[PDB]
CSV table of N, CA and C in Angstrom, one decimal:
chain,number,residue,atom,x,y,z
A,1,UNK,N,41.3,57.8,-43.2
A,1,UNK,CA,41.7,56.8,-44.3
A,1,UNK,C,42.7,55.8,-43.7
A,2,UNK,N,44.2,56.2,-43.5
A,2,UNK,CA,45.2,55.6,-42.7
A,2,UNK,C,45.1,55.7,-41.2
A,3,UNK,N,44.7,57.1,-41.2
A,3,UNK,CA,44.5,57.5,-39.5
A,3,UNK,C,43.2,56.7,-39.3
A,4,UNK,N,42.1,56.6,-40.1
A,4,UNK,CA,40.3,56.2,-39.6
A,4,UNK,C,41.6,54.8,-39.3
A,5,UNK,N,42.1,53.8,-40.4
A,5,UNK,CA,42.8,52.4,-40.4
A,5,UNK,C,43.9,52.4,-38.7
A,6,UNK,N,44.4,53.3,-39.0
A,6,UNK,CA,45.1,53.4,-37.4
A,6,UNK,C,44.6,53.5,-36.1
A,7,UNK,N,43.3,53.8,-36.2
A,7,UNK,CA,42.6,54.2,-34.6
A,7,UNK,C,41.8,53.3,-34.5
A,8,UNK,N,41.3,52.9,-35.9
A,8,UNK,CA,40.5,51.4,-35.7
A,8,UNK,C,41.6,49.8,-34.8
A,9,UNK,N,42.6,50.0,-35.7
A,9,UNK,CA,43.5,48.8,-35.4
A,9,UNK,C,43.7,49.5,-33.7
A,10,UNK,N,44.0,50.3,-33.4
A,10,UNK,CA,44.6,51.3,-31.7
A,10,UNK,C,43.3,50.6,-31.1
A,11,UNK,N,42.2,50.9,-31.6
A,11,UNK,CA,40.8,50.3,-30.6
A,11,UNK,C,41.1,48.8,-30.0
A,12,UNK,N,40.7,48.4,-31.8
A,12,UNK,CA,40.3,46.5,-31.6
A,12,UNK,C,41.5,46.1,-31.0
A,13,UNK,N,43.4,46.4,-30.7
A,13,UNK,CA,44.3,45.6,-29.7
A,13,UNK,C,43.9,46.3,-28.7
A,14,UNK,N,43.5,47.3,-27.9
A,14,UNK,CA,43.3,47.8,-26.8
A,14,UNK,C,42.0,47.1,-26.0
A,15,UNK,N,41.2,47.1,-27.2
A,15,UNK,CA,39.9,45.9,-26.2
A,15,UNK,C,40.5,44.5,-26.2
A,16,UNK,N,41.5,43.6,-26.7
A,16,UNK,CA,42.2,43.0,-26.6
A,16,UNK,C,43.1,42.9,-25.7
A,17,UNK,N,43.7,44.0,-25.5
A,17,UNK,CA,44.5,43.6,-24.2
A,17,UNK,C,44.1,44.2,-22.9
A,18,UNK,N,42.8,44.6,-22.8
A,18,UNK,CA,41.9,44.8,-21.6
A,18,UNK,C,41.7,43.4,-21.5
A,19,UNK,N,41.0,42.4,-21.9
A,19,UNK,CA,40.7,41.5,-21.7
A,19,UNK,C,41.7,40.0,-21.8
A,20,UNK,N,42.8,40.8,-22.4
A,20,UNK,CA,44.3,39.5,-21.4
A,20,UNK,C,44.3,40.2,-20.5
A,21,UNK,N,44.5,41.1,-19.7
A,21,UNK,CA,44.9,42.1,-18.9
A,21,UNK,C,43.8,41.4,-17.6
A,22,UNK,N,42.7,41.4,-17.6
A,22,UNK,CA,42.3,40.5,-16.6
A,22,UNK,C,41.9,39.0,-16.8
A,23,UNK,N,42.7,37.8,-17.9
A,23,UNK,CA,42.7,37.0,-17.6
A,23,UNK,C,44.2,36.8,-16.6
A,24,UNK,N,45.2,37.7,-17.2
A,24,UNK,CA,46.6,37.6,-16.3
A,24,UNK,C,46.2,38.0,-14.5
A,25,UNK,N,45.0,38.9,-14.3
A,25,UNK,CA,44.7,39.3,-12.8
A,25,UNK,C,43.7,38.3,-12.2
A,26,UNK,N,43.6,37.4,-13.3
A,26,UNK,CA,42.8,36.4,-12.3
A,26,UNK,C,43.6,35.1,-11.8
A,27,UNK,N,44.4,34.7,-13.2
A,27,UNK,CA,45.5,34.0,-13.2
A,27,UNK,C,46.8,34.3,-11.8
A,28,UNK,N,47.1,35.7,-11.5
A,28,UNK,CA,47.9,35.9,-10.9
A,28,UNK,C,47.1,35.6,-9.4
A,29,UNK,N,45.7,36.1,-9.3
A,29,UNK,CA,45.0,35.9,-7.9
A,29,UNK,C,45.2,34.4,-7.9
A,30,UNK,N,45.6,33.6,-8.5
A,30,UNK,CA,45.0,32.2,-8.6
A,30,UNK,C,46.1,31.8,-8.0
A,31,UNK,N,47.5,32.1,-8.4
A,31,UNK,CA,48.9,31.7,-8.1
A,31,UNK,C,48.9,32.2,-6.9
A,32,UNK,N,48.6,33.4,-6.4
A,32,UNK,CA,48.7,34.1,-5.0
A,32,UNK,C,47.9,32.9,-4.2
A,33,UNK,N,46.9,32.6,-4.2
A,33,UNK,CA,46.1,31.6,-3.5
A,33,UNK,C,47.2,30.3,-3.4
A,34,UNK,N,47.7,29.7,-5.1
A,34,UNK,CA,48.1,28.4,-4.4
A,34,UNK,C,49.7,28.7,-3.7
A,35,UNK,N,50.2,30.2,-3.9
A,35,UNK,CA,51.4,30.4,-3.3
A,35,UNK,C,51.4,30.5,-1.8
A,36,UNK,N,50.2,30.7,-1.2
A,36,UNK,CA,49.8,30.8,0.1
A,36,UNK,C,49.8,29.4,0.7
A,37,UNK,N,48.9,28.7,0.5
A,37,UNK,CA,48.8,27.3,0.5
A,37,UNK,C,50.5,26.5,0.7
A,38,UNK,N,51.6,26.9,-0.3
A,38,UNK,CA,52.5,25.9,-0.2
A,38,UNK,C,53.3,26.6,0.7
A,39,UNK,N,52.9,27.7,1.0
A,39,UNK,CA,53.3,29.1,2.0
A,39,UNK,C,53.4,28.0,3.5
A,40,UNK,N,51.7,28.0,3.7
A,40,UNK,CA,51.2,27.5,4.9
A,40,UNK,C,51.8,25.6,5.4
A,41,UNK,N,51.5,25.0,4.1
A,41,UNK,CA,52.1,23.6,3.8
A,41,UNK,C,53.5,23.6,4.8
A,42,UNK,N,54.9,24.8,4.0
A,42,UNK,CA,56.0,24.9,4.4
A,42,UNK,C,56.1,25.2,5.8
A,43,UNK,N,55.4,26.0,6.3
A,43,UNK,CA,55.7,26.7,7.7
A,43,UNK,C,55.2,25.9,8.7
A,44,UNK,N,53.9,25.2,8.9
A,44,UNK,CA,53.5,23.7,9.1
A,44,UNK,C,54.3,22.5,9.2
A,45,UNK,N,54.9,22.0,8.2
A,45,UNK,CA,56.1,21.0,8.2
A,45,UNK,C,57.1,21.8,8.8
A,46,UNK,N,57.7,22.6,9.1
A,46,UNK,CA,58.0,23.3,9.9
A,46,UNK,C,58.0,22.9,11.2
A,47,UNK,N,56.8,23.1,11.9
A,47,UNK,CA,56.3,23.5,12.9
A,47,UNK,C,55.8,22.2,13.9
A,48,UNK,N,55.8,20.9,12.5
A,48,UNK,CA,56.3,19.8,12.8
A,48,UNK,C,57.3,19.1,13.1
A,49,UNK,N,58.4,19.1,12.2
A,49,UNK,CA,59.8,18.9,12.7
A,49,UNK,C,60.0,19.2,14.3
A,50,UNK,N,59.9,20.5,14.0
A,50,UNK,CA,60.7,21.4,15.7
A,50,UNK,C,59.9,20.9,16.3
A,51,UNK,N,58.5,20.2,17.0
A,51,UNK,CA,58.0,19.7,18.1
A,51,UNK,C,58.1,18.3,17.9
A,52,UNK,N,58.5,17.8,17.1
A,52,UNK,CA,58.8,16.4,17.0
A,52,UNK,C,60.2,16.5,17.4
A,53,UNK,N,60.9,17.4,17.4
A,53,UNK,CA,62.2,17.6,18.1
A,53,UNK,C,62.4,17.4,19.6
A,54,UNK,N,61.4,18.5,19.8
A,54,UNK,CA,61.3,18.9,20.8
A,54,UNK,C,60.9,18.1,22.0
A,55,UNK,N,60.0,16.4,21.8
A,55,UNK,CA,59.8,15.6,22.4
A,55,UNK,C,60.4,13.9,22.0
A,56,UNK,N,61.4,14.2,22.0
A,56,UNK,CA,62.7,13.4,21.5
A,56,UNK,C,63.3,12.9,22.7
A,57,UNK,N,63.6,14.3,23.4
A,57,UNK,CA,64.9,13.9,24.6
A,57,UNK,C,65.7,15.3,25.3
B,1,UNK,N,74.3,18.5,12.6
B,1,UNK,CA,72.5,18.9,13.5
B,1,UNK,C,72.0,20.2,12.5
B,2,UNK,N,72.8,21.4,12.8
B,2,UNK,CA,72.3,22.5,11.6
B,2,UNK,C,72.8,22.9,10.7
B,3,UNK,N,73.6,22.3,9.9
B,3,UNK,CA,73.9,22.2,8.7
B,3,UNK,C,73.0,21.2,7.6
B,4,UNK,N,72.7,20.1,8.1
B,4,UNK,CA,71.8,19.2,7.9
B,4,UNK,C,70.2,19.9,7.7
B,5,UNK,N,69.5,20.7,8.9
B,5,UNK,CA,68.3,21.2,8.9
B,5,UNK,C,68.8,22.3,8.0
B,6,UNK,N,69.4,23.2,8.0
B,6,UNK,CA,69.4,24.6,7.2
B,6,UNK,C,69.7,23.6,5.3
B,7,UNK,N,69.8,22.7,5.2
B,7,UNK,CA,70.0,22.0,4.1
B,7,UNK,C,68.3,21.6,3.2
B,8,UNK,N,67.6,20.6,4.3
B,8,UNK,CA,66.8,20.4,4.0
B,8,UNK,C,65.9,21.6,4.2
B,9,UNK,N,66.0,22.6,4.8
B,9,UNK,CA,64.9,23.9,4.8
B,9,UNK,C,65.5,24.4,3.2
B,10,UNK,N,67.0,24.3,2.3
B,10,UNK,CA,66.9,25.3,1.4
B,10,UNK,C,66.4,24.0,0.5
B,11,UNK,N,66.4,23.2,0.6
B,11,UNK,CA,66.1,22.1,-0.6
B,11,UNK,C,64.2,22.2,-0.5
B,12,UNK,N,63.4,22.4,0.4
B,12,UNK,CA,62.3,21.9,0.8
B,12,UNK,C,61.7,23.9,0.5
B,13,UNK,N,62.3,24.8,0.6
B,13,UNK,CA,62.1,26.3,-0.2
B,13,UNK,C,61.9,26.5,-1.6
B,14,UNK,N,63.6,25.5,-1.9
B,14,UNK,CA,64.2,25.5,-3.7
B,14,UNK,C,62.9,24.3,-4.3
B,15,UNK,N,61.7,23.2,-3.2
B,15,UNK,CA,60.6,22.6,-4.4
B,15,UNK,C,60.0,23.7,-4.6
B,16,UNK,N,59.5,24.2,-3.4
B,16,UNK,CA,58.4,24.9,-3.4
B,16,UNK,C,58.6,26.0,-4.2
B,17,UNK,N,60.3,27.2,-4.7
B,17,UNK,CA,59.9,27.9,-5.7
B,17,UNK,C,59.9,27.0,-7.4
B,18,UNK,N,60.3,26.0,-7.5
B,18,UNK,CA,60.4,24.9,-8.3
B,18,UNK,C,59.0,24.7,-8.8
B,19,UNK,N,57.9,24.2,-8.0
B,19,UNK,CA,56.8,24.4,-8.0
B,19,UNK,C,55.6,25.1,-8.5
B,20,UNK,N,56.0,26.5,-7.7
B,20,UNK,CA,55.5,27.9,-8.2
B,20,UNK,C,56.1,28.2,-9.5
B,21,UNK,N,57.3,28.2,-10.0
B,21,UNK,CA,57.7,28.3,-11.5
B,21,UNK,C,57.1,27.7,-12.3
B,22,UNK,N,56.8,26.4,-12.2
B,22,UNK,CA,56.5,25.2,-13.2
B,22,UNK,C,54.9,26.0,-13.4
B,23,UNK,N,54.3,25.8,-12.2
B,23,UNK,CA,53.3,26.4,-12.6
B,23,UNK,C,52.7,27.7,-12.6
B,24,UNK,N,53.6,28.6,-12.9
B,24,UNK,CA,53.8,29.5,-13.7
B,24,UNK,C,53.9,29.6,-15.1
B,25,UNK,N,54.4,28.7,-15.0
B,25,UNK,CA,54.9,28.4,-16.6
B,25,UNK,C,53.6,27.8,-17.6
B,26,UNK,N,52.8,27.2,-16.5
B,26,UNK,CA,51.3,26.5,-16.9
B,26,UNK,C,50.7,27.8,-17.0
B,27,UNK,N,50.4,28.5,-16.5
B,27,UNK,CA,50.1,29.8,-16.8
B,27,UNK,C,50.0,30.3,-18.0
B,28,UNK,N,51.2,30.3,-18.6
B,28,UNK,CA,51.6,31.3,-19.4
B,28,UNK,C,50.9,30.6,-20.7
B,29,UNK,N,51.0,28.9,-20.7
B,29,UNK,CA,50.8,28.1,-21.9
B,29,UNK,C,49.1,28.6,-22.2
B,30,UNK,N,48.5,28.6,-20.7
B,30,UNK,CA,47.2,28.7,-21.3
B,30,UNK,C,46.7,30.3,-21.4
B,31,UNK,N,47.7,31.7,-21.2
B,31,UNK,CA,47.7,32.9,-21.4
B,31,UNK,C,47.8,32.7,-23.0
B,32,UNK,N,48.5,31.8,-23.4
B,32,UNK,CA,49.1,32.1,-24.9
B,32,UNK,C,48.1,31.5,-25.5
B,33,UNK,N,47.7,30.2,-25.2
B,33,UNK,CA,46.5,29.7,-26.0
B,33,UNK,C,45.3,30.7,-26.2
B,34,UNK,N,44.9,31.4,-25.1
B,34,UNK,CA,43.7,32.6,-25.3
B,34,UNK,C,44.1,33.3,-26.0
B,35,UNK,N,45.4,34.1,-25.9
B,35,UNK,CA,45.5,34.7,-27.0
B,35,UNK,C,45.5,34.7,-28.2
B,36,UNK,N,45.8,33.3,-28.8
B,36,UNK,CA,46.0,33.1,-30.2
B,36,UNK,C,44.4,33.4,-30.6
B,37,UNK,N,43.9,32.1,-29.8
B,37,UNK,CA,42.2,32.0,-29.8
B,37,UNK,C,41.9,33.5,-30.3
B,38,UNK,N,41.8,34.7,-29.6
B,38,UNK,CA,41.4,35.9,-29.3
B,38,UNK,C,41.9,36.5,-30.6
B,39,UNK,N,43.3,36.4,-31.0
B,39,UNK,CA,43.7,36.7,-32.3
B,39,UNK,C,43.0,36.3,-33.6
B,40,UNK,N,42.8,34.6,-33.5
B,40,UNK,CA,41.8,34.3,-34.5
B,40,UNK,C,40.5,34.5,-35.0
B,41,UNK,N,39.7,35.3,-33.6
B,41,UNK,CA,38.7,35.3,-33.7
B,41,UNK,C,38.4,36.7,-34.2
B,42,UNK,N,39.7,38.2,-34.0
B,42,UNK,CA,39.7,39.4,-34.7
B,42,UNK,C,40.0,38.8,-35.9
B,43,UNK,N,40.7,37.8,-36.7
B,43,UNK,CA,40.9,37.8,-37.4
B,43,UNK,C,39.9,37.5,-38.4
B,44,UNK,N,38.9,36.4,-38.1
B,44,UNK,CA,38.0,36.4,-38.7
B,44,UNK,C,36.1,37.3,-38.3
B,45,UNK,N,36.4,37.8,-37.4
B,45,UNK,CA,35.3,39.1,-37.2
B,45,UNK,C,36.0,40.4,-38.2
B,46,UNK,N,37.3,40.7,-38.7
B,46,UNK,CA,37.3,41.4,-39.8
B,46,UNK,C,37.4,41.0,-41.0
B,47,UNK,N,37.4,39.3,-41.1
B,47,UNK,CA,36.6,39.0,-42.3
B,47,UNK,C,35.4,38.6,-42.8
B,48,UNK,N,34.7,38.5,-41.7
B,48,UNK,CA,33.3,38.6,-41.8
B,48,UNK,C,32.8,40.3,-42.2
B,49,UNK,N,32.9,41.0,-41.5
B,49,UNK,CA,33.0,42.6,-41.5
B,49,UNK,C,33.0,42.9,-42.7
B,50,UNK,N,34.6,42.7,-43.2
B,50,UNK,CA,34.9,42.8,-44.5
B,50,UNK,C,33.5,42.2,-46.0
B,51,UNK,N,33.7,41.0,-45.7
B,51,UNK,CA,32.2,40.8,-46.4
B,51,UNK,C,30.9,41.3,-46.6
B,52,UNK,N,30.8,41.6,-45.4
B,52,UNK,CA,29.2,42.2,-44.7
B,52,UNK,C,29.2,44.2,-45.5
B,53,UNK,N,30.2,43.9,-45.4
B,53,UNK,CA,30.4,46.0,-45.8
B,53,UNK,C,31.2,46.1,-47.0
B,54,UNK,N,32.5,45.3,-47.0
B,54,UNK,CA,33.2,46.2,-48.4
B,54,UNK,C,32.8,45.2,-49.3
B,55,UNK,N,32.1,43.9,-49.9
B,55,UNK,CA,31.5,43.4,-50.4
B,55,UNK,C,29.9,43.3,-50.5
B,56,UNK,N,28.8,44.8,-50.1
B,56,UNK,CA,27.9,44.7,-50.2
B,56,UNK,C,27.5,46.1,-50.0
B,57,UNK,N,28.1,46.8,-51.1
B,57,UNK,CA,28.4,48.5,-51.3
B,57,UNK,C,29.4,48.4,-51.7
């Protein structure tokens, strides 16, 4: 009655938050990607500077 | 000489986490948009439901 009304409501947010649950793991894969990228960006300009240094003088 | 470089490496760190926050924050806008979505749409599959069963019996 309350309990059938309780375990129904426990279901339908639980298949609910399975399915935020991997939009947040795809979302998060997505950020890891472009965190990599400004990762590589940084270490690059980097890597620029110091040999632009380096043939200075 | 390195006061200047260790300057521009924390300023040119502090975009890049600047960056990654912001869009993070983009993230989140469209984690919340699905979810409302996802809420509206239990909301109205238990009023369809409702119809289909406690108004036809």
């Amino acid at each position: 009655g309350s309990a059938r009304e309780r375990d129904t409501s426990r279901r339908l947010l639980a298949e609910k938050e399975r399915e935020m649950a991997e939009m947040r793991a795809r979302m998060q894969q997505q950020l890891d990607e472009y965190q990599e990228l400004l990762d590589i960006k940084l270490a690059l300009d980097m890597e620029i500077h110091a040999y632009r240094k380096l043939l200075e003088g």
